[PDB]
Amino acid sequence: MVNHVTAYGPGLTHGVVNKPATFTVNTKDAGEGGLSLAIEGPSKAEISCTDNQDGTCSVSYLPVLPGDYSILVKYNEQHVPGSPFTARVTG
């Protein structure tokens, strides 16, 4: 899976229940386009997203049950490299 928008950060791979899990979405010299973020898992995780002002987005989700969460990141209907990701969220 290679390449355009990219995503990296701890929240893409692991987290802990009831604490915010975070990762970054780098849109430096992406076109213009639609960025989709979704998270699927054993609970409805609240997503928050702040523009860091430098072409980078800082994204966190708040998982309330432990388990596996799929993080899906698409740019213009296409999967970013590594998307869908899988975060092991422990208790």
Binding site: E32, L35, S36, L37, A38, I39, E40, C49, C57
Partner: peptide, 17 residues
Amino acid sequence: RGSLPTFRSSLFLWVRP
């Protein structure tokens, strides 16, 4: 996947210079 209920949270952003 499928044994327990699964939920989705979503966000869509338009990115533009």
